[PDB]
Amino acid sequence: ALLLQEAQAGFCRVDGTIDNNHTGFTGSGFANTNNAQGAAVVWAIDATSSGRRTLTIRYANGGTANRNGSLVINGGSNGNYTVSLPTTGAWTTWQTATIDVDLVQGNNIVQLSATTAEGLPNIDSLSVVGGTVRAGNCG
Ligand SMILES: O=C(O)[C@H]1O[C@H](O)[C@H](O)[C@@H](O)[C@@H]1O
Ligand SMILES: [Ca+2]
Ligand SMILES: [Ca+2]
Incomplete structure (x- = not known):
């Protein structure tokens, strides 16, 4: 499993x-x-082969409403997904959301963007499982 943190290779913006x-x-x-609305977190994943990966997003949402995200691969050219991000009850309570996505062979810039005016929840990390994946290019 590739675990992408802020301030490490594969975290873009x-x-x-x-x-x-x-x-x-x-x-x-x-x-x-x-x-x-539209405020994003962006990662980059290099995949040696195309195929389904499971993405696990760890997050905290101390607000009063879902802060769902749109998740797109390569600016929408390679996939458009929805990520449900309900309240976690506090900014100190973290949960995960998981989505299966089809990565393309090579570089996959993954942009998770807020669908509501509240922006996203706070995003701790992105974990990626499936085939051979490593940090990609921002780009
Ligand atoms: O509503 C929000 O997005 C923000 O609320 C507070 O400022 C909280 O401390 C932030 O961590 C959070 O991002
Ligand atoms: Ca915020
Ligand atoms: Ca983190």
């Missing part, structure tokens, strides 16, 4: 900040999006 002021994250922190 957050529209917002990398923060560490709520306990329970892993790595050096978590991605905190701007509170705006």
Whole structure:
């Protein structure tokens, strides 16, 4: 399993900040999006072969509503998915959401973007399982 953290290869961008002021994250922190629709967290995964991977997103949502995300591969050219991100009850309570996705052989820029004006939940990490995968190119 490829485990992608902020501040490590394969983490590309957050529209917002990398923060560490709520306990329970892993790595050096978590991605905190701007509170705006479309605000994103972006990763890059290189896959030696095309095929289905399971993506596991670890997150905290201390808000009062779902902050669902759109998850696209290569700017939507290689896939458009929906990720449900319900409240976790506190900014210190982390849960996971899992989605199966079809990665293309080579570079896969994965952008998770807020569907609501609240932005995303705080995102701790992205875990990727399936075939041979490593950090890709931002790009
Ligand atoms: O509603 C939000 O998105 C934000 O709420 C608070 O500021 C919280 O401390 C942040 O970590 C969170 O990102
Ligand atoms: Ca935020
Ligand atoms: Ca983290």
